[PDB]
């Protein structure tokens, strides 16, 4: 009962330690080690892929450094693979069926530790910037799964990868009442934000910053402000440890597999035969149920993607060019106590707070009787209007849209206001509150949740779109209350009862 | 002067190749088709890649089409990797070439063919609108692309005036599957799966008791796989489309792909002076392939030949194909229903095919008891709380919108 195993490896020392691990796992049932070099070119790897498949006794292939032009052939023959040096999340789609049971996580799984940062903090003023990529989109859906249970502050910020364009986009992020920044992009976009946030002073006091691992490189390290807390995967480079553990897992698998029925070996050679070798996925099912008690990298176990079961995370703080290792994340167990945290504002403590503003934007539409949009005077002021008792009625600036007429979006008009609820807000701001800002909506609609035609999106329009997008903060309007608007938006007590 | 290969694997009609091949329809614009014929018999994708590399794809021919007769899936990956490394176009004609519906990155090319699954979902609604019959249940397997057309069709019904409803979408892959199939009360069960999956589910659903007479199934051809078999368990009178390539045969699809290559070549060469040369070695180019940001799919996506705009999407799905709707038979594997061609539905007899509960009711319109409106011009059907009329065209399908007290 001798079983061959291929392993696409870079140097011969790897193939030597592969052969020695085969002889060590031959303690139980015999094994066999064939040596596969790592090809420098893609089509040459697709050339030499099935010259090793002449030996049909290969039942698993280890790969290393993209391994795209070789992983498809193994999933085409349903061979269980291990992608050892994979930090790419495109293979995490297991609907391709050219994937593997996971080693160390590709990139996005550190965001679970980012969700466990609120176990230290319980912060709920958190802004997220995503570079627009599929791996970023997978991290988006990962965070949306992580939130469903709080730190439920702000939706998203989008970013187009390939341009600089930070300040023109994210100048709004200076104003959005929150201090927690989470970066998820490439290292070059990280340096672009680093220099633009240096231009915008967005890495000052209060501003706490959270990054991942692949943003941390020397180009970004020159531009990283001293105080950023960074992550690092335990055993990112000890490849031979993952080699020997992979030999022990496949030896556990073939230990279970040599006590089974209907072996039905692959064809010798890649071709000249059928390609629907049926015990392929069943061996992957056995590898899915295969476990590992303990290794040099620890206890290797498998999640639904096969992922590594509290992959430990060394955490560093860049303090005066030196990444001071803050301590070890181990799942439920936290970075305990040992090292002092320097924060990016010269601070020594965690900023437990945010900036509740005394300036909020109250945007609404024109509605007689409660709103009479009046044209301003020659100096832009208001005509002094009296009551029936001669009392000066409060005319505040209802800053209009760029329309004087719908279809001429040019006349950004001051249009100081006149109406019933104007004095109500004057009463409330006298009693409790602040110096407001007032805008008038362009389309003038209440707005319904109309279906956008872009593969099943449904977006609120009008003021409901504006408040949901954060363009407005308080909506005073003669608007009724249905369940539909109440599905997402908090309503106050109903002031004027009507029919 | 464009070196073109046409490549097949078995069952060739070489005289239709010799005959189609009309130089006068390529009437001296800028290019002439330097055509070469290859025939194979391989189940050998490795030697398929290697000898084609060894052929004039490295030496002479810059553009090639390819046909099959099988049901293979990895031909998609063979397409994707040659698109990944070589700007030379390969096209899909028949067999496991037009059965390739696979999502990909922004590629250099695609096995361009007829319809999509989104066009099949729409015509499935158009048939359920025309033949007055109502979907309420879908089932799917873990095939990538299941949920988009599901969310499409359900949201499309949510914007119409009259409305189909939905019992359940069953994302599936323990024989209590029969108990989840017990909850399906719709006359229509739509399904996304494979042919071996379909035959297994046909054993399961006939073990439920929801067989071919009570609750009829509706597939696309990808679920049917090969359109020329009843493997084990196909129930009578099921519904499917691929299908106009069956009306084509060989030399119509030869005239399709050849003239599309020659036209889109003259599309570029209408004002461009030349064409990029084929690279001398496929697996050792590695410096000359980056000389061309290719971008000729601007000219490949918009090609009209003989007044027929063979226009694709970004994923090479044809925007204007023809759809032939076909029923099964108790004894045969497919017979007929009718056809579909770009928002034009032509079906046979306007009679729901069947195998007493129904009673033919004769009546006269008298308000307020009977009110006959016409159908809506946007859809062609009746609204909520209205029923279809049947009055003799003096075919009898003048069909109007009856209602009333």
């Amino acid at each position: 009962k001798i079983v061959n195993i291929g392993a696409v490896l870079s140097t011969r020392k790897h193939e030597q330690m592969f052969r020695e691990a085969v002889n060590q796992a031959n303690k139980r049932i015999q094994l066999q080690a064939t040596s596969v070099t790592h090809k420098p070119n893609a089509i040459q790897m697709a050339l030499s892929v099935c010259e090793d498949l002449i030996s049909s006794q290969v039942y698993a292939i280890l790969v290393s450094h993209t391994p795209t032009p070789v992983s498809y052939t193994a999933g085409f023959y349903r061979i269980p693979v291990l992608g050892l040096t994979t930090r790419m999340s495109i293979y995490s789609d297991k609907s391709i069926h050219l994937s593997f049971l996971r080693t160390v996580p590709p990139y996005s799984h550190q965001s679970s530790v980012w969700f466990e940062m609120m176990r230290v903090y319980n912060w709920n003023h958190i802004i997220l910037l995503v570079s627009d990529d599929h791996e970023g989109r997978a991290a988006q859906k990962r965070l949306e799964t992580l939130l469903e249970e709080g730190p439920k502050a702000e939706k998203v910020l989008q970013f187009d990868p390939g341009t600089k364009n930070v300040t023109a986009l994210l100048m709004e992020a200076r104003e959005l009442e929150a201090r927690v920044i989470i970066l998820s992009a490439s290292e070059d976009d990280a340096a672009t934000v680093y220099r633009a946030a240096a231009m915008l002073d967005m890495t000052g006091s209060g501003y706490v910053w959270l990054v991942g691992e692949r943003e941390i490189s020397g180009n970004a390290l020159r531009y990283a402000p001293d105080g950023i807390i960074g992550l690092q995967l335990i055993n990112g480079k000890n490849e031979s440890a993952h080699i020997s553990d992979a030999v022990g897992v496949v030896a556990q698998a073939v230990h279970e597999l040599l006590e089974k029925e209907n072996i039905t070996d692959p064809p010798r050679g890649c071709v000249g035969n059928t390609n629907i070798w049926k015990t392929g996925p069943l061996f992957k099912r056995v590898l899915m149920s295969s476990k590992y008690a303990d290794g040099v990298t620890g206890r290797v176990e498998f999640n639904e993607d096969g992922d590594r079961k509290f992959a430990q995370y060394s955490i560093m703080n860049l303090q005066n060019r030196k990444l001071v290792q803050v301590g070890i994340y181990n799942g439920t167990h936290v970075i305990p106590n040992d090292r002092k945290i320097i924060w990016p504002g010269g601070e020594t403590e965690k900023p437990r707070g945010y900036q509740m503003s005394t300036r909020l934007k109250i945007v609404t539409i024109h509605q007689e009787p409660f709103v009479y949009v009046k044209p301003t005077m020659s100096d832009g002021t208001c005509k002094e209007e009296f009551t029936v008792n001669g009392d000066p009625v409060k005319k505040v600036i209802c800053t209009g849209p760029n329309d004087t007429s719908p279809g001429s979006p040019r006349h950004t008009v001051p249009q100081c206001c006149y109406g019933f609820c104007i004095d109500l807000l004057i009463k409330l701001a006298r009693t409790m509150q602040f110096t407001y800002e007032v805008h008038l909506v362009a389309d003038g609609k209440f707005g319904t949740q109309e279906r956008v035609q872009n593969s099943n999106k449904k977006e609120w329009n009008g003021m409901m779109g504006e408040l949901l997008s954060g363009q407005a903060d308080m909506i005073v309007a003669p608007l009724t209350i249905n369940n539909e608007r109440a599905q997402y938006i908090e309503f106050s007590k109903p002031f004027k009862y009507q029919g | 002067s464009i070196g073109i290969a046409v490549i097949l694997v078995g069952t060739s009609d070489e005289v239709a190749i010799k005959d189609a091949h009309e130089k006068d329809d390529f009437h001296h614009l800028s290019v002439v088709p330097r055509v070469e014929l290859v025939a194979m018999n391989e189940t050998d994708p490795k030697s398929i890649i290697t000898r084609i590399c060894d052929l004039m794809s490295d030496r002479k021919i810059q553009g090639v089409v390819f046909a099959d007769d099988t049901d293979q899936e990895a031909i998609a990956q063979i397409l994707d990797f040659i698109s990944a490394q070589t700007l030379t176009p390969i096209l899909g004609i028949h067999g496991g070439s037009s059965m390739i519906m696979a999502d990909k990155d922004e590629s250099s090319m695609f096995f361009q063919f007829g319809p999509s699954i989104e066009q099949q979902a729409s015509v499935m609604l158009n048939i359920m609108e025309e033949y007055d019959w109502y979907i309420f249940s879908i089932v799917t397997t873990y095939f990538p692309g299941y949920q988009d057309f599901v969310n499409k069709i359900r949201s499309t019904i949510e914007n119409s005036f009259v409305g189909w409803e939905l019992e359940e979408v069953l994302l599936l892959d323990d024989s209590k599957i029969q108990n989840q199939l017990k909850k399906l009360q719709s006359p229509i069960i739509l399904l996304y799966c494979t042919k071996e999956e379909a035959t297994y589910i046909f054993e399961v659903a006939n073990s439920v008791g929801l067989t071919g007479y009570g609750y009829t199934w509706i597939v696309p051809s990808l679920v049917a796989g090969d359109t020329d078999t009843v493997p084990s368990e196909f129930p009578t009178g099921l519904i499917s489309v691929s299908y106009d390539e069956w009306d084509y045969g060989l030399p119509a699809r030869v005239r399709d792909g050849i003239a599309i290559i020659t036209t889109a070549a003259s599309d570029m060469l209408s004002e461009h002076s030349f064409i990029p040369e084929p690279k001398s070695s496929c697996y050792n180019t590695h410096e000359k392939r980056i000389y061309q940001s290719n971008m000729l799919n601007r000219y490949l996506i918009n090609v009209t030949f003989e007044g027929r705009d063979l226009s694709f999407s970004e994923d090479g799905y044809q925007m204007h194909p023809k759809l032939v709707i076909i029923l099964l038979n108790k004894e045969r594997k497919w017979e007929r229903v009718g056809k579909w061609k770009d928002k034009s539905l032509q079906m046979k007899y306007y009679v729901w095919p069947r195998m007493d509960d129904h009673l033919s009711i004769v009546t006269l319109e008298e308000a307020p008891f009977v009110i006959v409106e016409s159908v809506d011009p946007l859809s062609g059907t009746c609204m909520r709380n209205t029923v279809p009329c049947q009055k003799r065209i003096i075919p009898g399908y003048i069909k109007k919108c009856c209602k009333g007290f």
Partner: antibody
Amino acid sequence: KLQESGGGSVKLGGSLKLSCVVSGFTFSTYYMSWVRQTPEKRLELVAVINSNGGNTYYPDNVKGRFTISRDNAENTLYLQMSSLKSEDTALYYCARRDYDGFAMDYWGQGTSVT
Amino acid sequence: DIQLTQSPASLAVSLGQRATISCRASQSVSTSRYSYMHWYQHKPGQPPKLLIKYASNLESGVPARFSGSGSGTDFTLNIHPVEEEDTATYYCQHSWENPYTFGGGTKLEIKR
């Protein structure tokens, strides 16, 4: 690398040979051009060639008023114009093109055709 | 025919500024995944080369005091900050299928 050779003053409706010495690269696989710079700085076209000698292309208004010949061994392009009117008094630039190649990577200094 | 036009064709700003130069045309040319215009810049008389290939792709031996963006029928270039050797005329080129489409030219000086 590239240096425009000739130009000068031409009469109305006259013919002129426009030459350009090339040093540094080969002709039979590479791609060059000829563009026009007016005294009003309106960028126009003179000559469109192939990358391998091959064929050429003619801009529409100047079509039939010039011909192109590529002597690939001696690395100097030739361009014989004809019927030069008053609306061709412009500085002409020879420029090597890209591998795409509708951009230009290298340039000549510039001839002056009056 | 598509026709590129440049704005503003003549100006002069001081040192260390955001010198943004826009270019307009009729039809959208930048569609699939690459943008389409090659910014040329050179002094009067001398041909300094291309500086931007498609939208921001810098060439060999270029400064870092400029950038280029834009899409649809409106691309632009933005010099920021402003150098002292900025007495040159700047140019636009994406052609078409249709042989070659050119823009005008933007001559810039340094305020002092």
